[PDB]
Amino acid sequence: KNKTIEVYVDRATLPTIQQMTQIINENSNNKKLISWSRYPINDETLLESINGSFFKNRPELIKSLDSMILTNEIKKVIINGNTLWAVDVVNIIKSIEALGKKTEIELNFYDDGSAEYVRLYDFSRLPESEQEYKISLSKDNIQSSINGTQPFDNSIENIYGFSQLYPTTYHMLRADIFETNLPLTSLKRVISNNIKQMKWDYFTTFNSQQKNKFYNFTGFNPEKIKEQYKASPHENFIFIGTNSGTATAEQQIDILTEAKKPDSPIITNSIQGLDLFFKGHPSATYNQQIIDAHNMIEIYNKIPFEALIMTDALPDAVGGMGSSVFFSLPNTVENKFIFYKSDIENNALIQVMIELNIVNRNDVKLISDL
Ligand SMILES: Nc1ccn([C@@H]2O[C@H](COP(=O)(O)O)[C@@H](O)[C@H]2O)c(=O)n1
Ligand SMILES: [Cl-]
Ligand SMILES: [Cl-]
Ligand SMILES: [Zn+2]
């Protein structure tokens, strides 16, 4: 009983990309069980190089996990998951504990995107006593879910409340959220020793083989985009697109025509004279309409922007639509404007982004502004 199994799960993309990067950085030979919704790995050479198995779904992964634990050889399981979707790690914990094999469990939660930060803002609006009360309930909430007596509510106090039960690290998009004007002292006390700031400078220390492993995992290689950046000597701008749940194609086309004016009263930070790139949202299907109307260099929409970040393929400047993308973007890239579908003072997404200095209050715009 000296073996550790590492479990990797995610429904989105950001935790997956960060999880891939940690696996590569650590280069451990522990057995790994992997289930990533957006990144099915069928590459057996890749999987063998990390000692991994891939599972198409959570119940299959759990089945293999449990049989391994039944061998009596498993000292510890490290579960790596998605904070918003902590429910998936709850069900993994439930299955391990049920077996009653005295398995050590340790947890790494990676933020999903903007949702955690919208929820943190909302939670910070609560009076302090109500925050403390919700927190007081969290340990029992989580334990009841693990015991199987109640469903799991992914409220702030619950998803950030696991360090009360297990050795837990929260890898956060912006760990410095607890150092803004938001009243979050109540939650900070719970997790202050359990927080890591997500890092994006791994490639600075990676050797070639590590870099190549990242390309192989993601199916992304930054060579084409890096050539596109340098093709012309002008500074590079990426427009961050959204999907129809937030904006129409026409509204984004209109935003781009306003931005191209050197003297807009709305978009004061002009994109005139820049090399313009369009990065579409992975789920948008109107990207060609926008790209054509503006003669923009296309960055394939299915590439998650965090792959651009991790591979150091960043532009000089950025602007566009309210998005999780802006939360992981390094602060060295200039943010010219963000448009929101939204009275901005009551908008949690806008306010958290202002508080984190992701965007100047003067550069926040509403789609109704054109
Ligand atoms: N233009 C965009 C918009 C979103 N995205 C990806 O989609 C994820 C979720 O973004 P949203 O919050 O915008 O839906 C981001 O973390 C990023 O991976 C992107 O890569 N390019
Ligand atoms: Cl350029
Ligand atoms: Cl769409
Ligand atoms: Zn140019």
Secondary-structure blueprint of this entry?
Blueprint: E1 3-10, H1 14-26, E2 31-36, H2 44-50, E3 52-54, H3 58-70, E4 74-82, H4 86-98, E5 104-110, H5 114-125, H6 128-147, H7 156-159, E6 168-172, H8 185-191, E7 195-197, H9 208-218, H10 223-230, E8 236-240, H11 249-259, E9 275-279, H12 287-294, E10 297-299, H13 305-310, E11 317-321, H14 325-328, E12 334-340, H15 348-355, E13 364-366
Parallel strand pairs: 1-2, 1-4, 2-3, 4-5, 5-6, 6-7, 8-9, 8-11, 9-10, 11-12, 12-13
The chain binds cytidine-5'-monophosphate (C5P), chloride ion (CL) (2 copies) and zinc ion.
The site of cytidine-5'-monophosphate has 17 residues, from α13.
Walk me through what this model shows.
There is one protein chain. With 370 residues, the chain is an alpha/beta fold. It has 2 domains: 1-218, 3-Layer(aba) Sandwich (Rossmann fold); 219-370, Rossmann fold, CATH 3.40.50. Helices cover 39% and strands 19% of the residues. It has 15 helices and 13 strands. The protein has helices at residues 14-26, 44-50, 58-70, 86-98, 114-125, 128-147, 156-159, 185-191, 208-218, 223-230, 249-259, 287-294, 305-310, 325-328, 348-355, and strands at 3-10, 31-36, 52-54, 74-82, 104-110, 168-172, 195-197, 236-240, 275-279, 297-299, 317-321, 334-340, 364-366. Helix 1 (14-26) runs antiparallel to helix 9 (208-218) and helix 4 (86-98) crosses helix 6. The longest helix is centred in the middle third of the chain and has 20 residues, at 128-147. The chain is globular, with a radius of gyration of 22 Å. The termini are far apart. One chloride ion binds at residues 229, 232, 234, 236, 275. Residues 232, 234, 275 line the site of zinc ion. Keywords: Glycosyltransferase, Metal-binding, Signal, Transferase, Zinc. InterPro entries: PM0188, Sialyltransferase_N. This is Alpha-/beta-galactoside alpha-2,3-sialyltransferase. CMP binds at residues 241, 279, 281, 305-306, 323-324. One of its GO terms (molecular function) is metal ion binding.
